């Protein structure tokens, strides 16, 4: 009934995900695993659908075997009336696609020791906050988000599920200096998908014919992923997710934040961004 978050080692989490960390202690990573890591609302499902297509040889028929949350186990995931990411993992064939949003501080050390390849996607903070706000509304395990203005404040101080966005994109950016990480930008996936898909291939190590590349580019577009029940979380139960309130597959654009951000909010957020982001070579596009 909109349980409030629970804090674990500085990080605020969904009551249940906090509990899901118990059995996560048991998790043994294989070396052929690949970790998809992102701050919520930055392209998890998109890069997931890309990566599984790669893993099925460009075969849309196989990418339909189950919905995306069953093909790519959500490591820390746990909710009522759905199986825990870890329960789902016990039936996932290798080589396995795995999904988290946990900060390094909560990440299972087995993934780091096993040098598991990581595909990380970042997205400009403004679009993330907007996206995250509507998601909080329709994804009923989160706390009451309140007014946009109040939610935006919380977001600036990382008083939201998975903590601070600013900490998250920065720490994983530094991690890639010691660990195998392809660091991708949502807005780059918008500008030229084909380009970002060939980078994933290089990284994962697969060659595929253009026929099959161009193919994937089309079957991973917002529009196709929106109508595909295996990728749009519409098969989930209503009490866990409610698409009338807001669809998971909401808009899929860069620069949309502008229709929610007040000009006073923008001015303030900008000044706060510069202050937090200033010792960091990362750099985002918002349009
Ligand atoms: N194929 C695609 N291309 C572009 N954006 C996509 C996409 N599939 C999903 N999205 C968008 O990516 C966000 C989902 O993030 P995550 O998977 O990390 O939860 C949502 O953003 P919006 O709410 O801004 O539309 C969703 O609509």
Residue numbers in the entry: 8 to 294
Paper lines:
Sulfonation results in inactivation of the majority of acceptors, including neurotransmitters, steroid hormones and drugs, thus modulating their biological activity and rendering the product more soluble and readily excretable.
The determination of four new structures of SULT1A1 in complex with the PAP donor and different acceptors enabled us to monitor conformational changes in SULT1A1 upon binding of diverse acceptors.
